Structure 1
């Protein structure tokens, strides 16, 4: 029986959480961790980034091996249809509710 703050602390430590009051059933959220990536790994090896961004990186940072760019950790959801939503966001209700549970 938890607040959003305890759910967040639980997420930071790599757990799965959910709210009883959600409309969809069988969902949970989780954290994806932070990582620092070499810039030329971004420009040349990463499939999941748009070309526009890769071009901007090349333009403003370049191909130095030393240079690395940090990707922040963030929340994701296993939604009701079984898809993974990157970037889960907390509604006002999620934030002030106290019906969070560990899954």
Structure 2
């Protein structure tokens, strides 16, 4: 019987959490921590990045092998259909509800 604040503190400590009131079933959210990558890795190996973004990184860093780009922490959802949504966002109801529970 947790508020979103308590759910967030559980997420920050690595738990999976959910709301009892969600329409879908089997769903949960989790936090992915901050990460920092060398820019040359961005430009040439990391995918799921659009060519325009890789070009922007290249044009701002070049061949550097010590320049870094930092990715903030963020929330994700294991959705009803089993897919993963990077970038879960909280509805008004989610933020203000007190029906949060720990899944793991």
Taking the aligned partners of 1:7 and 1:83, their CA distance within structure 2 comes to 21
**Where does the alignment leave 5 or more consecutive residues of structure 2 unmatched?**
none
Taking the aligned partners of 2:6 and 2:62, their CA distance within structure 1 comes to 41
Give the CA RMSD over aligned residues.
0.8
When the two structures are superposed, what TM-score results if normalisation uses the length of structure 2? 0.95
| Cα deviation, residue 34, structure 1 | 1.1
When the two structures are superposed, what TM-score results if normalisation uses the length of structure 1? 0.96
Deviation readout 1:30-73 (Å, 9 max, x if unpaired): 11121000000100111221110000001112221111000111
Deviation readout 1:4-50 (Å, 9 max, x if unpaired): 01101100111100000100011000111210000001001112211
Taking the aligned partners of 2:66 and 2:14, their CA distance within structure 1 comes to 29
Taking the aligned partners of 1:81 and 1:37, their CA distance within structure 2 comes to 31
- How many aligned residue pairs are there? 103
